[PDB]
């Protein structure tokens, strides 16, 4: 009776009347005497006592008492829909779910009503009012459904218009206060939970073909009470994590939002972070972080923005879960392997022309090149709300506070070094994904970095040397000591040292100070389809450019050496010892520049 | 990357690193540094401590690949062990493309082995084999060992105690250059054979309630994998048929069955393909499975040592686990009483209300 009451209001919006003219039957066609002939199908009408119409294969049945709808008047305006919801729906109660079609109709009415006045100034009024309505009448109903994804898809298609704070309010209230203290909701939640655990006990590498579909249906229909057992089971078991990340490919946006919700729930639940024994971190942080990284890697419609706001926020207080999630995100999605163990030949190839570098990286088991698209997506998540500079400064100034703690040295050294490597790897990712003008736009330019925050000079140059070399080489208009002008260079004590030597040391690199020319030939000879695109477009063009660069740099160093114990002391003090203690390439480069630059 | 302290080839280092090896055992660090120089080695160690890896890394170090030249010959006792040694050579030679490995054992046409030996695409520098088949190849000049530099004999005790095996290995040894590297490896070298956290519980009940009880336990306990110990093959196969009928994926392994299917199902369950496995005491010793977290002793054994061997399949390398046993007769309680006196362990009676799941994970 309610659906008949509401139908004419529903057709007036979400206009289907213009599309009503497509419910017709195929004409019976027959070939007689060698010509086509069309006829209509013939049916007859019977009257029965059953209320719902039907059509049993030749004839149509109808309810006999054809004026039962005489005493009722359909709605004329959504306001009447509210006024009569308060009577019929407050009676039907949580059982509205027994008829899915009503959910769809009311939700589409809501969507069209919100879309009708996108321009007007009073939109927030209608948004608040529909928020209250969906909170009180529809969401408890949709919590009752049984393996029926599309209805929840519709309700969420309406919910998409709210601030996410409100969606979290509704979800959490439904979880805490309305699951208990209401009977049919409690029954449905308990049934769904028991069924979810029953399925979770039977996930295998061999039975995934059907268990994945069943789990997808069950999670998509009634997520926020069937997800928590799954979240715990992957919180402390090994392979269920990979299995779940495999089966996320199937559920709709509602499951996605609820999944992100319960992830924040578990990440914020009150419990200890460090292991009971000592300073070792607990055994769930790692598996949860692996899960989150797998999510960011595989399913690309996940929208983990709020988790990244969690990171950017809770790093301020030094939460270990933030650092861990960041490490696993960088290493799994981005593909940025560290430089702890590198043979001298690989270390050499790792800074050369493009193809030699690519071969070196693929040899060191690094896959940053093949992951360009998803790395760009993640850095786009980071780009919004301008988290880049805040995160770099946070990581840096956090490692210092880690240096000033008190513990056993055997853990202090390892912690400090681990933070250092994490920062280095993050900056490698940032330089890989943000190029051109976007870099200079969202990476906090040099002089502020070095004068306001007092970063140590090696990190400053480690960020800016590539961009400075690029702006110097092509656009020969500007010159060094101008594009880096104004820097205070605080710990340097530029007295009693030629700033020419300073900037000539830190500006350069290894690629522009050493030409082997043997590795190029080795690669060219071992590479001899179209012959691999003609030896990768005659890789040797990069070697030619490399020769030109070597020649220009050596020409520079000639006049510079024509130009230049106190200096011999301060040079070691502030120029080669700080440079060597960095990653290996800085050490090799300090070695090479010690020679070929002096008498 | 402890093997990086070994100062070996980088591609070999990557092939070891992708094999999960991170810290060498005692026997590896004690033997590989000296075997790399080409000295003969005679090794005795406890089984399963990575004795194959020693000489595998050694021969992958000392080899300089020469086309069509066989320098490395390994002789074993079985065909499946030969397959395992060639698989080890393959997982060790991932980053070595020029080197080629081959395996020789009975049951295959000798002409196919010959033609693959003549093929340049399959001309092997490393050959693992059974002594009889490789003897039949050398004596027919199907393979040339005039340039062999490395001779490995695994399980050398059985190689030298059996007369046919020692004669075959000596015929292979006399056809090799005398100035070669020689290595023998075995877990058992008697004196007679060139300058060489676990939780323990029990259920005392009657037989006719077992089938429903597990159907409850296997329903409530949170588990990765479950193993079911039985005393007979018929009861085990029946319980597996019923469990698979119970929407519970389960496998069965025991005697009275062809070895092929035993290896097949053993390997299958090792790979996390199903979550329930049932076996008699055939796997009472030697088995190594990590993910088993919950064990159900359907029928107790006769002696305490067999029960401890059973429970050893859980809590591998000092990890956490849960064990629960069935008691249905007098000798069951007898062995239950004897295990505590020998092993100093209180096997309490399993409470009805269940145990905290975190007490075993």
């Amino acid at each position: 009776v309610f659906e008949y009451l509401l139908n004419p209001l529903y057709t007036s919006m979400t206009s289907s009347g213009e599309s009503k003219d497509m419910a017709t039957a195929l004409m019976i066609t027959r070939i007689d005497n060698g010509i086509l002939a069309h006829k209509p199908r013939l049916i007859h009408k019977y009257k029965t006592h059953e209320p719902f119409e039907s059509l049993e294969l030749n004839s149509s049945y109808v309810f006999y008492y054809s004026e039962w709808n005489s005493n009722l008047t359909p709605f004329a305006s959504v306001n009447d829909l509210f006024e009569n919801s308060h009577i019929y729906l407050s009676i039907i109660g949580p059982y509205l779910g027994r008829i899915p079609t009503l959910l769809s109709k009311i939700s589409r009415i809501g969507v069209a009503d919100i879309q009708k006045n996108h321009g007007s100034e009073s939109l927030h009024v209608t948004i608040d009012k529909w928020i209250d309505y969906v909170r009180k009448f529809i969401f408890p109903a949709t919590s009752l459904l049984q393996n029926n994804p599309i209805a929840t898809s519709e309700v969420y298609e309406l919910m998409k218009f709210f601030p996410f704070e409100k969606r979290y309010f509704i979800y959490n209230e439904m979880m805490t206060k309305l699951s208990q203290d209401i009977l049919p909701l409690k029954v449905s939640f308990n049934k769904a939970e028991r069924e979810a655990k029953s399925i979770l006990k039977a996930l295998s590498i061999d039975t995934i073909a059907k268990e994945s579909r069943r789990f997808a249906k069950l999670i998509s229909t009634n997520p926020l009470a069937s997800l928590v057992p799954a979240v715990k089971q992957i919180e402390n078991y090994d392979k269920v994590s990979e299995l779940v990340v495999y089966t996320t490919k199937y559920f709709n946006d509602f499951a996605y939002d609820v999944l992100q919700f319960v992830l924040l729930l578990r990440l914020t639940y009150n419990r200890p972070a460090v292991q009971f024994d000592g300073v070792n971190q607990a055994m769930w942080v790692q598996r949860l972080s692996i899960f989150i990284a797998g999510l960011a890697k595989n399913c690309p419609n996940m929208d983990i923005s709020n988790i990244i706001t969690y990171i950017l926020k809770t790093l301020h207080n030094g939460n270990i879960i933030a650092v861990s999630i960041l490490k696993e995100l960088i290493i799994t999605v981005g593909g940025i392997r560290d430089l702890n163990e590198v043979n001298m030949k690989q270390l050499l190839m790792l800074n050369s022309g493009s193809p030699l570098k690519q071969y070196a990286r693929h040899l060191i088991y690094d896959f940053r090149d093949d992951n360009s698209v998803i790395s760009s997506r993640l850095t786009s998540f980071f780009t919004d709300q301008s988290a880049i500079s805040e995160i770099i400064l946070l990581l840096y100034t956090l490692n210092l506070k880690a240096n000033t703690q008190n513990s056993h040295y055997k853990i202090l050294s390892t912690r400090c070094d681990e933070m250092n490597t994490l920062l280095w790897s993050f900056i490698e990712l940032i330089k890989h994904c943000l190029k051109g003008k976007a870099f200079e736009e969202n990476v906090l330019p040099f002089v502020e970095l070095n004068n306001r925050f007092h970063l140590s000079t090696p990190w400053t140059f480690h960020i800016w040397r590539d961009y400075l070399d690029n702006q110097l080489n092509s656009n020969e208009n500007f010159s060094i000591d101008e594009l880096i002008e104004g820097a205070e260079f605080s710990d340097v004590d530029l007295t009693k040292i030629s700033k020419d030597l300073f900037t000539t040391f830190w500006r350069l690199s290894l690629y522009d100070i050493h030409f082997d020319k043997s590795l190029y030939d080795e690669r060219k000879n071992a590479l001899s389809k179209h012959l691999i695109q003609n030896q990768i477009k005659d890789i040797l063009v990069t070697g030619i450019s490399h020769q030109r660069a070597f020649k220009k740099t050596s020409e520079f160093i000639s006049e510079k050496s024509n130009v230049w114990e106190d200096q011999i002391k301060i040079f070691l003090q502030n120029c080669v010892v700080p440079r060597v203690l960095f990653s290996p390439s800085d050490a090799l480069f300090s070695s090479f520049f010690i020679f070929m630059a002096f008498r | 990357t402890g093997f990086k302290d070994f100062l070996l080839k980088p591609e070999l280092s990557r092939a070891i690193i992708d094999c999960g090896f991170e810290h060498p055992s005692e026997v590896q660090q004690h033997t590989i540094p000296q075997s790399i120089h080409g000295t003969d080695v005679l090794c005795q160690a406890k089984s399963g401590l990575g004795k194959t890896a020693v000489f595998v890394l050694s021969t992958l170090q000392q080899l300089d690949p020469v086309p069509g030249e066989v320098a490395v010959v390994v002789i074993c006792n079985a065909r499946e062990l030969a397959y395992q040694i060639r698989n080890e050579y393959l997982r060790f030679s991932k980053y070595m493309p020029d080197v080629k490995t081959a395996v020789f054992y009975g049951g295959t046409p000798i002409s196919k082995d010959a033609e693959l030996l003549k093929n340049k695409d399959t001309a092997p520098h490393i050959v693992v084999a059974t002594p009889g088949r490789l003897k039949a190849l050398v004596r027919e000049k199907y393979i040339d060992l005039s340039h062999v530099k490395n001779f490995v004999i695994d399980e050398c005790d059985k190689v030298l105690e059996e007369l046919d095996m020692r004669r075959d290995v000596q015929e292979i040894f006399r056809a090799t250059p005398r100035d070669k590297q020689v290595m023998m490896f075995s877990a058992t070298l008697s004196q007679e054979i060139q300058n060489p956290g676990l939780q323990q519980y029990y259920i005392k009940l009657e037989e006719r309630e077992k089938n429903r009880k597990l159907a409850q336990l296997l329903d409530d306990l949170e588990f990765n994998q479950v193993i079911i110990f039985v005393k007979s093959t018929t009861r085990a196969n029946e319980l597996t048929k019923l469990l698979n009928a119970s929407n519970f994926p389960a496998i069965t392994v025991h005697g009275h069955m062809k070895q092929e299917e035993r290896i097949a199902r053993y390997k299958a369950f090792k790979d996390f393909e199903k979550r329930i496995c049932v076996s008699t005491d055939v796997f009472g010793r030697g088995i190594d499975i990590e993910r088993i977290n919950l064990a159900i002793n359907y029928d107790l054994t006769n002696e305490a040592d067999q029960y401890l061997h059973r429970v050893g399949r859980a809590g591998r390398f000092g990890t956490k686990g849960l064990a629960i046993s069935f008691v249905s007769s007098k000798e069951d309680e007898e062995v239950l009483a004897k295990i505590q006196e020998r092993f100093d362990v209180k096997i309490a009676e399993f409470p009805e209300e269940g145990i905290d799941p975190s007490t075993y994970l």
Partner: peptide, 24 residues
Amino acid sequence: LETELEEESTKGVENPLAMAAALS
């Protein structure tokens, strides 16, 4: 009906799949 429903909800009932459908 209320009591039976609440009990069958909170406690739940084990659906016998192969329970007691054999012996030995």
